[PDB]
């Protein structure tokens, strides 16, 4: 029998939706070398080139659906014996410019998962590839040149026998795509940053190991006669002085076998190494279990008297630098049956109750 073809449901502009099987649209195969270093690009391709040569249930729906209101979930099913561990970081950035830096610092901003295969069997995270709207499409991200980058921030503490593979499973979940928009309001409730405060290596042994990371975060991170920049870190340097509850996220990057206990505290630069009374200050102890890999330090408003400067002159010494630092001090000693350093990654997630004062003319440099 005949029917009126104009009135059929062929102009169905639904988003992609269903179970996790029927929304999967690509799988990606990352090769982790037996002997990989820190700061080492494992994968680096455009997010649309992920879906080339694919034949999953939602692959054709993904390409052809004009609007998608759901987020992209990516899950990474990589594992390794507790004996070893490393730290991978997958990360999505809205674009590129020629001959780009792939230092962890540069990348992490915007949208990223960081995990240690040694501890976490798998790791998933959702994100919105259009950061200033509720929607996106396959055609948007192909032409916008959205860029996915997997990087190894810390090498294998004990190398596996053979090469490894990380399978990424790109799906579309059904959460609302909420936008992350930075703006120039002086008082903001939550200013996210995802600023890589730095990788902290502590060698195995007995010595007083102390690591300072300055909270004058603005004006990027260092290189040769050069400096690197995220957007959010460049954005916070718009203001001269600032303050707020700082929400760090400290992560283990070595294996579970390398054990160490770490005190974190706010304090000023003048304090030397071999000053044995760091626990006079208020502080937070961080022991990691075998399975735990991630821990969130928060430092309230009572840790800071006044606001402090976003940038400082590069040539100011630790002796005359009146902005606060975040100390990370080994409480006992770095130990283990196997050789390898106790790596530890600190990441300023965001500032709560942010208050930005003034208007930075700027400084030009990075570290303090």
């Amino acid at each position: 029998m005949e029917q009126n073809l104009f009135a059929l449901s062929l102009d169905d502009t639904s988003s992609v939706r269903g179970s996790l099987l029927d929304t999967k649209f690509a799988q990606t195969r990352v090769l982790l070398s037996k002997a990989m270093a820190g700061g080492d690009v494992l994968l680096d391709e455009y997010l649309y080139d992920v879906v080339n040569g694919q034949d999953f249930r939602a692959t054709v729906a993904f390409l052809r659906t004009h609007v998608i209101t759901g987020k992209i979930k990516v899950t990474a099913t990589t594992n390794i014996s507790d004996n070893s561990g490393c730290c991978l970081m997958l990360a999505i950035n809205s674009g590129v410019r020629g001959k780009y830096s792939t230092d962890v610092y540069t990348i992490c901003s915007q949208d990223s998962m960081t995990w240690n295969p040694g501890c976490k069997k798998n790791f998933s995270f959702t994100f919105n590839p259009n950061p200033c709207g509720d929607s996106w499409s396959a055609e948007m991200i192909s032409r916008s040149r959205v860029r996915m980058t997997v990087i190894c921030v810390s090498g294998w503490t004990l190398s596996p026998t053979t090469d490894v593979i990380a399978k990424l499973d790109w799906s579309i979940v059904n959460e609302k795509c909420e936008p992350t928009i930075y703006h120039l309001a002086d008082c903001q409730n939550w200013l996210p940053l995802n600023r890589w405060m730095g990788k902290l290596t502590f060698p195995q042994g007995v010595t007083s190991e102390v690591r300072r990371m300055p909270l004058s975060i603005g004006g990027g991170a260092g290189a040769t006669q050069a400096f690197l920049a995220n957007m959010p870190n460049s954005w916070i340097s718009m203001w001269r002085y600032f303050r707020g509850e700082l929400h760090f996220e400290v992560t283990k990057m070595s294996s579970p076998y390398i054990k160490a206990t770490v005190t974190f505290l706010i304090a000023f630069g003048n304090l030397s190494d071999a000053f044995g009374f760091y626990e006079s200050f208020p502080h937070r102890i961080v022991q990691f279990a075998e399975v735990e890999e991630k821990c969130t330090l928060v430092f309230s408003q009572q840790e800071f008297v006044t606001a402090w400067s976003t940038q400082v002159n590069p040539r100011t010494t630790l002796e005359a630098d009146g902005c606060p630092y975040l100390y990370a001090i080994i409480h006992d000693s770095t130990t283990g049956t196997i050789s390898g350093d106790f790596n530890l990654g600190v990441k300023l997630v965001g500032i709560k109750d942010f208050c930005g004062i003034g208007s930075n003319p700027g400084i030009d440099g990075s570290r303090l």
Partner: protein
């Protein structure tokens, strides 16, 4: 004048472009890509250009999606040339694109001797909920250039583009930029 209005705000210097040295007398020009922070002089004229790294510029270079007004202040120096012998003029042109087909969004025309200032503004506004990714193939979005012309480069020594966000300004998204070199302003003795 003679009594001035009142300048007030913090404008950070982004892009200087010194004019080619002697004996080059011909008419010449330069283009400041205001958003992406690039300085392409016209033809094969050896202009001496620098891009500085104040917070405004670092945001404009790294931010993907942008929205709202930026105020510019174009300063012009300024060779030590007797005022009655000055014949140099400065034509500027805001443009969306740098193609021959596109038109200007604004033209200014200055013939003040020695030195000059020129405050203007323009709103970056774009398709994606009011945001514009500069030079993206998506929706054929485009930048803002600032073509500037020195009719007498013996007399005009250098251009200088200072900028400032209006408080309405908003960004989103990050771009992976290469390492920015540390060029510093060589202040005049």
């Amino acid at each position: 004048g003679p009594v001035c209005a009142e300048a007030s705000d913090v404008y950070s210097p982004c892009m200087i472009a010194s004019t080619p040295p002697a004996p080059f007398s011909d008419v010449t020009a330069v283009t400041f890509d205001l958003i992406n922070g690039k300085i392409t002089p016209v033809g094969d004229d050896n202009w001496n250009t620098h891009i500085y790294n104040p917070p405004i510029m670092n945001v404009l270079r790294t931010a993907a999606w942008k929205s709202g007004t930026i105020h510019v202040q174009l300063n012009v120096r300024g060779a030590g040339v007797k005022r009655a012998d000055w014949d140099g003029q400065v034509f500027v042109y805001l443009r969306q694109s740098m193609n021959p087909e596109s038109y200007d969004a604004r033209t200014f025309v200055i013939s003040q001797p020695g030195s000059a200032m020129l405050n203007f503004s323009f709103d970056i506004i774009g398709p994606n909920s009011g945001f514009e990714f500069a030079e993206s193939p998506w929706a054929n979005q485009t930048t803002w250039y600032l073509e500037c012309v020195a009719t007498n480069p013996r007399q005009i020594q250098q251009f200088e583009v200072n900028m400032r966000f209006d408080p309405n300004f908003r960004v989103a998204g990050n771009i992976l930029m290469p390492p920015f070199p540390l060029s510093t302003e060589t202040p005049p003795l």
